[PDB]
Ligand binder design. Structure first.
Ligand SMILES: Nc1ncnc2c1ncn2[C@@H]1O[C@H](COP(=O)(O)OP(=O)(O)OP(=O)(O)OP(=O)(O)OP(=O)(O)OC[C@H]2O[C@@H](n3cnc4c(N)ncnc43)[C@H](O)[C@@H]2O)[C@@H](O)[C@H]1O
Length: 188
């Protein structure tokens, strides 16, 4: 499974809170059949388990802060292994969010062939979150934004240098955004 995974198409999806990551990923799953792994969903699944670990994660995520790298990466890796036998490709949604998170993923799992940069303005994100969990109040949204611009924007730079970033314009209507997404995936 390790080797299957290292040989799979691996797509990173990066974007600010409320930018449209999950929305576009669900469209990618429906059309292309990738195995969707949301870091948020995996973390919230742990919270919902009622485990002691979940309670810890709850406290972190409700404050809008980043969970320890090893915790989220281990979750994803295990999730990839469990799906490795049946998976046609992996869609990694909301990881990496730090340059170090990308590096450790490449060390422990494999190399991305594509990064979809789901690009939107902060203002757009804020109103999208507002119009739509426990991380939803004003203060938390701001911390989430802060962290994104501080920690996660360097990830885009990293993979632009790698040469695998395709920017999609998330200010467009969802289907027009997806048309950009499709163009990038069809090219793989
Ligand atoms: N790697 C990691 N390392 C450490 N900690 C981590 C971590 N990953 C997660 N965590 C922790 O978990 C927390 C949650 O993170 P996480 O769940 O991973 O990311 P998020 O950005 O907070 O997720 P969102 O669902 O809020 O945003 P989204 O981009 O998916 O937008 P969506 O498609 O739903 O859309 C939002 C709204 O906008 C609408 N919408 C989407 N696109 C459009 C469009 N084009 N036009 C109009 N409306 C649109 C949608 O219908 C919807 O209503 C993190 O803060 C962190 O604490």
């Amino acid at each position: 499974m390790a080797d299957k995974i290292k040989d799979a198409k691996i797509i990173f999806v990066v974007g600010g809170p409320g930018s449209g990551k999950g929305t576009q990923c669900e469209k990618i799953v429906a059309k292309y059949g990738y195995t969707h792994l949301s870091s948020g969903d995996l973390l919230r699944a742990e919270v919902a388990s009622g485990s002691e670990r979940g309670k810890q994660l709850q406290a972190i995520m409700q404050k809008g802060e980043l969970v320890p790298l090893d915790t989220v990466l281990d979750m994803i890796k295990d999730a990839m292994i469990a799906k490795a036998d049946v998976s046609k490709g992996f869609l990694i949604d909301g990881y990496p969010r730090e340059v170090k998170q990308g590096e450790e993923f490449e060390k422990k799992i494999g190399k991305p062939c594509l990064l979809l940069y789901v690009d939107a303005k902060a203002e757009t994100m804020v109103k999208r979150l507002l119009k739509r969990r426990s991380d939803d109040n004003e203060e938390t949204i701001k911390k989430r934004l802060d962290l994104y611009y501080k920690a996660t924007e360097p990830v885009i730079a990293f993979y632009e240098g790698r040469g695998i970033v395709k920017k999609v314009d998330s200010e467009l209507a969802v289907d027009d955004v997806f048309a950009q997404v499709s163009k990038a995936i069809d090219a793989l």
